[PDB]
C-alpha cells in the first residue's frame, strides 16, 4: 500500500525538515543527489532526495535504509539519517571526496600492492555482510567509494538480500550483468558467493580497466558468462602467481570451491597489500581527470 509505505517510512525517519541540520547544498546528480554540510558536526554529506510519487519500487528503499541502519561497518559508506517531508524522502550518507573505484581504474594504473589493499577492504565488508546473512548482489567498481586518504567503502544497498538458514538461496536477477556470477543465470539458487565472483570481476577491472565483455550488449555478455565460465585475462603472465591464484579462487565456476569472504581474507595475495594511503595519488589523479 502507498499509505502503508509512507507510514512505515514515517516510523523510520527522523522528524522535521532537514534544511535545518544541513547547509551548502550543491547538486551533483539527477532521485537528486547533493553534497552539503552538517551545520552541527561540520561533516560533509551526500544527500539523495526522492519524490516518492515517482519512485516505482519503494519497498526496496525501506529495505535499503533498514539494512544500512543495522549493518554499520568501517568498510560500508556510513548512513547518517533520513527525513520525510510530505512525499519527499531524504537519505543522508557520509560523503567520500575521492570518487569511486571506477574513476581510479579508468584513469590510472594500479599496482598489485594497491589492488591487494582494495580487495582486502572489500572482503572485510563482504565477510561482515555475509556473516550477517546479507548479500549485496550488485558489487562493481561504481559501488566502491574512496576517501582522499585511500579509505575503501562499499555502497548501494538498493539490491541486497537478507537470507536465513531455511531460505539460504535467492533466485532474483538484480545484479549488473557484466559482474554477475554465472550460476545466477544457469540455476535458480545462488548464495553469498555471487558477491565473491563480482569482486573477482572488479579485480579484472583493476588490472585491465574494464570487466570482461564490456563492449558487448548486456544480454550477450550474460550468455557469454554463462557459457564461457571463468573469464580469461589478456596477459596473465604479467601477474604474480599469488594474484593469479587469488583470481582463480574468486572466479571458480564451482560455487563450493570458490572462496568464501572469510577464507579469502586469509589469502596470501592480501599480504602484499600496500598501506591504503598509497592510493592517494591515483585518487587525486582520477579526480582531476574526471572533474568535467
Rg computed from alpha carbons, rounded to a whole number of angstroms: 19 Å
User: Which shape, going by the Cα principal axes?
Assistant: globular
Task: Name the structural class.
Answer: alpha+beta
DSSP summary: helix tally = 10
CATH class of the largest domain: Mainly Alpha
What percentage of amino acids are in beta strands? 15-25%
Q: Could you give the order of the helices and strands? A: HEEEHEEHHEEEEHHHHHH
Strand order in the sheet with the most strands? 1-2-3-5-4
Number of domains: 2
Helical amount among residues, as a percent range? 25-40%
Please render the helix and strand layout as text.
Elements: H1 2-12, E1 22-29, E2 32-38, E3 44-51, H2 58-70, E4 79-85, E5 88-94, H3 101-107, H4 112-131, E6 134-135, E7 144-146, E8 152-154, E9 161-162, H5 183-186, H6 193-208, H7 218-228, H8 241-250, H9 261-264, H10 280-289
Antiparallel strand pairs: 1-2, 2-3, 3-5, 4-5, 6-9, 7-8
Summarize the structure.
By secondary structure, the protein is of the alpha+beta class.
Write up this protein.
This protein has helices spanning 2-12, 58-70, 101-107, 112-131, 183-186, 193-208, 218-228, 241-250, 261-264, 280-289; strands spanning 22-29, 32-38, 44-51, 79-85, 88-94, 134-135, 144-146, 152-154, 161-162. With 292 residues, the protein is α+β, with helices and mostly antiparallel strands. The N and C termini lie far apart (42 Å). 36% of the residues lie in helices and 16% in strands. The chain folds into two domains: 1-95, Phosphorylase Kinase, domain 1, CATH 3.30.200.20; 96-290, Transferase(Phosphotransferase), domain 1. The strands form three sheets. Strands 1-2-3-5-4 form a five-stranded antiparallel beta sheet. It has a two-stranded antiparallel ribbon with strand order 6-9. It contains ten helices and nine strands.
